[PDB]
Amino acid sequence: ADEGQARKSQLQRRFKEFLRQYRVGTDRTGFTFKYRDELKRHYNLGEYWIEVEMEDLASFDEDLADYLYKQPAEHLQLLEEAAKEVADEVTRPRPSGEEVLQDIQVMLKSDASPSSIRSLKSDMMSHLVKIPGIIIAASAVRAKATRISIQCRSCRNTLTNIAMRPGLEGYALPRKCNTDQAGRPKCPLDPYFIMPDKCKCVDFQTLKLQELPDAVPHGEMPRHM
């Protein structure tokens, strides 16, 4: 129901107020708006990313930090959308050729002590984890779709800007044609195809993280993640 969207709106507002109001310093010396300033400078440099500290977020509002730890996938996109809002209201107006607002990648770092690869057990699935290791392999950079549009082969009925879930998860095309009547033919079994010219894609990479040599139990080979 739309009460979930109400919850999303208020949580996005709280992330926006974190990025709008957080300061570092003291009244004896002076204050700087850390994340506003980083957003402004990175956007003007054409970087379109910031890195947020979990302890800063927890000091501002500990519930948001707890939500990010427990349910990072759900709340990180709200944080990124709030970052996009703050970037807009921090950089507006922009010169010609920069009118269209860009998406902001929000990265995370923390002062917390890390876990091992062998600490990752089924209780922690979908939770936010911090682990060390060595990069032993790295793939070529490739394209992952973030937005697609799909068109029906019979009636040319189109679904636009389908949100693609991040990560190695894919997307299921609809089994039957959407929103129009069961005419003749009703449906060929895959009615939809992905339109070639409308996809928005981002870079992605696959890497292998090896366990640290001093973390390995005696007699065992280092694990991979």
Place this chain on the structure above:
Amino acid sequence: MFVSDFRKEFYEVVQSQRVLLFVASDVDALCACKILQALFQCDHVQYTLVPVSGWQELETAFLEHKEQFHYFILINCGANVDLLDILQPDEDTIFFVCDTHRPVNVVNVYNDTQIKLLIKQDDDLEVPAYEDIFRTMRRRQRREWEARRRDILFDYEQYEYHGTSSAMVMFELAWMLSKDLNDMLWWAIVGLTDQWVQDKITQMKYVTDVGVLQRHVSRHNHRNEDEENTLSVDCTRISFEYDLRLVLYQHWSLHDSLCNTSYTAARFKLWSVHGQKRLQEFLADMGLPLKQVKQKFQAMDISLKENLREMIEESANKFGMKDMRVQTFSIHFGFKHKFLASDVVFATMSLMESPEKDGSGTDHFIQALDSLSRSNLDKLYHGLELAKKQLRATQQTIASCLCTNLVISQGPFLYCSLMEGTPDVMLFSRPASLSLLSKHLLKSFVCSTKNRRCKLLPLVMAAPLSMEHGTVTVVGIPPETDSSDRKNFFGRAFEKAAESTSSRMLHNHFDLSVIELKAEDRSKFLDALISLLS
């Protein structure tokens, strides 16, 4: 003589003058210096500040500066010796003395012209009357009076102890002037907490002084604030806390706090191999996961923390630790800066007694003094890291002493000695850190041993000091009973032994119960101490 009114007879006098501050190297002295600096900077009093780590460098600084200054202020030094004889001043200088050390020297008390004691008259003071101390059958009664004088004055000078915090005295001055800022109240709190952390006062007196400071905290918390009008996050908020006795536990893991706190380390006997299972039993009784307990406190799950203090108290009561809570204070400002008074005490103390060889002890004083101002929060956090290192080194040293059985009962008193070249001895070579080590080690020993006799003894500890001159630092500690009144006789016992043996004893530290001794004379010095305490 005692200053009756600090505003009228001390501050309004030195307000018009150039002043020289001699400041001792301890956190209470630093806090009093910060408060007095703030008042002088408000009034444009052209002061000069000199750190002094001992009597000889106090004498050196006075010899350097006596020509140019007529008004001197001694912070946590001078009250327990004859300053006139020590410094040999000109006839028309003035020495204001704000010092916690007791008993006050009788010459300091009854000097009515030159020595002015910034000491509260309602402290634990019992001065002998003037006629008992100062001027055929007539000469026979003269000799009898002199014998009675020796008896009475020994009874007066026997037990050394500490009175009200100098930071609290200077805060009362600031309050009377009505220039008492919230950071000045915080510095007063930190001075009292320094006294409590170093066990210089009884728990009753600490609770009474906390009761005094609570009212000032309430006044400052209602100067511009109530339940419906509130200030910026920039402003400092001091809050009364019935917090936990664990050390630095909001800045590292609860596991490290339980391991490196003196009380819980002593009770669980974590120096021993078996004690870690006792601690694990305590944590399992609480129901805290070990991963959360070993995680940093700020990164611990928030569902574990919002009743942690009463959970700790409830489990501690059924484990026999009946007083895990303590009445203390905290300061908040900004979004993320939060400190207990104990945290600030340990950070500043570590910055003073740092093991770093670069610079000098006065440079480390300067680092500690800077760290008490909020313009040097980086210095405060660096001090917190140094405090974590210091606490860990303290526990390793206690474990070494108890495991090797260096603590041997020398009849009247337990005896311990650090050895040159062993780990962290250079960190503990400084007398303040050595005093803290000896107190923590005595608590650990009393919890360790099963003999009823050993639980009541005092302790004497020695450590190397010098090889260019071949000397050791020796400290004396009273017994660690809960009934103790925190008074000790070792300041006078040491000099009685030293004069009985004609030992090469040097007496530079401001506490009489800490001495420097030639490494050869320690044998006969200890023999005299056993003979003396009997």
